[PDB]
Write a protein that holds these residues in place. Sequence first.
Motif, PDB file in Angstrom:
ATOM      1  N   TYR A 217      52.101  13.852 -30.221  1.00 53.00           N
ATOM      2  CA  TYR A 217      52.192  12.400 -30.527  1.00 53.00           C
ATOM      3  C   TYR A 217      50.996  11.656 -29.928  1.00 53.00           C
ATOM      4  O   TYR A 217      50.313  10.913 -30.606  1.00 53.00           O
ATOM      5  CB  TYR A 217      53.490  11.959 -29.855  1.00 53.00           C
ATOM      6  CG  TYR A 217      53.868  10.592 -30.349  1.00 53.00           C
ATOM      7  CD1 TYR A 217      54.170  10.399 -31.697  1.00 53.00           C
ATOM      8  CD2 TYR A 217      53.912   9.520 -29.456  1.00 53.00           C
ATOM      9  CE1 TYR A 217      54.520   9.127 -32.158  1.00 53.00           C
ATOM     10  CE2 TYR A 217      54.261   8.247 -29.912  1.00 53.00           C
ATOM     11  CZ  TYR A 217      54.566   8.048 -31.265  1.00 53.00           C
ATOM     12  OH  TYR A 217      54.909   6.791 -31.719  1.00 53.00           O
ATOM     13  N   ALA A 218      50.742  11.849 -28.662  1.00 54.77           N
ATOM     14  CA  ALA A 218      49.593  11.151 -28.010  1.00 54.77           C
ATOM     15  C   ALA A 218      48.264  11.693 -28.539  1.00 54.77           C
ATOM     16  O   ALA A 218      47.309  10.959 -28.698  1.00 54.77           O
ATOM     17  CB  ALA A 218      49.737  11.455 -26.521  1.00 54.77           C
ATOM     18  N   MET A 219      48.189  12.968 -28.816  1.00 54.91           N
ATOM     19  CA  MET A 219      46.916  13.538 -29.336  1.00 54.91           C
ATOM     20  C   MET A 219      46.742  13.123 -30.793  1.00 54.91           C
ATOM     21  O   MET A 219      45.640  12.919 -31.268  1.00 54.91           O
ATOM     22  CB  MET A 219      47.075  15.059 -29.220  1.00 54.91           C
ATOM     23  CG  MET A 219      46.030  15.619 -28.248  1.00 54.91           C
ATOM     24  SD  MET A 219      46.849  16.593 -26.961  1.00 54.91           S
ATOM     25  CE  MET A 219      45.787  18.055 -27.072  1.00 54.91           C
TER      26      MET A 219
ATOM     27  N   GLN B 291      55.621  16.031 -27.565  1.00 54.13           N
ATOM     28  CA  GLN B 291      55.268  14.642 -27.166  1.00 54.13           C
ATOM     29  C   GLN B 291      53.749  14.567 -27.052  1.00 54.13           C
ATOM     30  O   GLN B 291      53.132  13.568 -27.363  1.00 54.13           O
ATOM     31  CB  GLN B 291      55.929  14.424 -25.803  1.00 54.13           C
ATOM     32  CG  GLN B 291      57.436  14.235 -25.987  1.00 54.13           C
ATOM     33  CD  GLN B 291      58.012  13.517 -24.767  1.00 54.13           C
ATOM     34  OE1 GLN B 291      57.760  12.347 -24.560  1.00 54.13           O
ATOM     35  NE2 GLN B 291      58.781  14.174 -23.942  1.00 54.13           N
ATOM     36  N   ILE B 292      53.143  15.647 -26.630  1.00 61.62           N
ATOM     37  CA  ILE B 292      51.657  15.678 -26.520  1.00 61.62           C
ATOM     38  C   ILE B 292      51.057  15.519 -27.917  1.00 61.62           C
ATOM     39  O   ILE B 292      50.099  14.799 -28.112  1.00 61.62           O
ATOM     40  CB  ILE B 292      51.336  17.054 -25.911  1.00 61.62           C
ATOM     41  CG1 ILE B 292      50.840  16.860 -24.476  1.00 61.62           C
ATOM     42  CG2 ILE B 292      50.263  17.786 -26.725  1.00 61.62           C
ATOM     43  CD1 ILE B 292      50.702  18.221 -23.797  1.00 61.62           C
TER      44      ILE B 292
ATOM     45  N   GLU C 193      57.081  18.644 -24.018  1.00 62.60           N
ATOM     46  CA  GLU C 193      55.826  17.999 -23.547  1.00 62.60           C
ATOM     47  C   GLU C 193      54.717  18.252 -24.560  1.00 62.60           C
ATOM     48  O   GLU C 193      53.822  17.450 -24.722  1.00 62.60           O
ATOM     49  CB  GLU C 193      55.501  18.662 -22.204  1.00 62.60           C
ATOM     50  CG  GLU C 193      55.295  20.168 -22.398  1.00 62.60           C
ATOM     51  CD  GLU C 193      54.758  20.779 -21.103  1.00 62.60           C
ATOM     52  OE1 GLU C 193      53.653  20.432 -20.720  1.00 62.60           O
ATOM     53  OE2 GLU C 193      55.460  21.586 -20.517  1.00 62.60           O
TER      54      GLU C 193
ATOM     55  N   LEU D 261      62.214  11.535 -27.729  1.00 60.83           N
ATOM     56  CA  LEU D 261      61.416  11.820 -26.504  1.00 60.83           C
ATOM     57  C   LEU D 261      61.951  13.071 -25.802  1.00 60.83           C
ATOM     58  O   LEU D 261      61.336  14.120 -25.828  1.00 60.83           O
ATOM     59  CB  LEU D 261      61.595  10.586 -25.618  1.00 60.83           C
ATOM     60  CG  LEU D 261      60.937   9.376 -26.286  1.00 60.83           C
ATOM     61  CD1 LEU D 261      61.244   8.116 -25.475  1.00 60.83           C
ATOM     62  CD2 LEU D 261      59.422   9.587 -26.346  1.00 60.83           C
TER      63      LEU D 261
ATOM     64  N   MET E  84      47.540  10.334 -32.038  1.00 62.74           N
ATOM     65  CA  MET E  84      47.096   8.911 -32.074  1.00 62.74           C
ATOM     66  C   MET E  84      45.746   8.762 -31.369  1.00 62.74           C
ATOM     67  O   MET E  84      44.950   7.910 -31.710  1.00 62.74           O
ATOM     68  CB  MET E  84      48.182   8.137 -31.324  1.00 62.74           C
ATOM     69  CG  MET E  84      49.206   7.597 -32.322  1.00 62.74           C
ATOM     70  SD  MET E  84      50.145   6.253 -31.555  1.00 62.74           S
ATOM     71  CE  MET E  84      51.528   6.248 -32.723  1.00 62.74           C
ATOM     72  N   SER E  85      45.483   9.586 -30.389  1.00 62.33           N
ATOM     73  CA  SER E  85      44.182   9.492 -29.663  1.00 62.33           C
ATOM     74  C   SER E  85      43.020   9.729 -30.631  1.00 62.33           C
ATOM     75  O   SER E  85      42.139   8.903 -30.768  1.00 62.33           O
ATOM     76  CB  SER E  85      44.231  10.596 -28.607  1.00 62.33           C
ATOM     77  OG  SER E  85      45.215  10.276 -27.635  1.00 62.33           O
TER      78      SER E  85
END
Lengths: 76, 112
Positions: B95-97, B92-93, B89, B84, B99-100
């Motif tokens: 990662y969220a993008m 880490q972004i 950012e 993390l 999976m989104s």
Amino acid sequence: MQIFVKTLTGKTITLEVEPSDTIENVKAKIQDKEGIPPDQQRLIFAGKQLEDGRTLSDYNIQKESTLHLVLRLRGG
Amino acid sequence: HMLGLGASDFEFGVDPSADPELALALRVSMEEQRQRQEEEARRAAAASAAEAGIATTGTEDSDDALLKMTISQQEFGRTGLPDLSSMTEEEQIAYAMQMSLQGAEFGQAESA
């Protein structure tokens, strides 16, 4: 409406928001629920980053939508 | 006479021994370039030496050991999370993008 937010720890939080609410308002809602600074909160959906100046409706986000939360490191 | 090529050609341009500031300045720059051509000539000779002359060469005691020992202590250092604060950012972004867009997509992808 209510929406879900998943963090890097697979944790999902349920919040109450409207489609006209801005992303900045959603971050403040997550802070009051957990305690994280809105400046370090990032909302990601369908691979698109949400802009604090945009509202949930702008990203076609409907009730029961699942958003992703990311940590932003740029504040000293 | 004039000052174009008469008494205007000695401004620190006569000899290096006439000033320790110009003698060391040219000695510090010449040594710096040698370090670049050296670390680059030593690493290049070692890489090519492990393809045609795998035999001894200069320093080949722990070749794979340095590859395993280094990744053994690093890979075996807390690996129950996708890191993390070690990334950014945007990392880490990703990662969220990552999976989104990888959630509800049964027919609507990135076709042209």
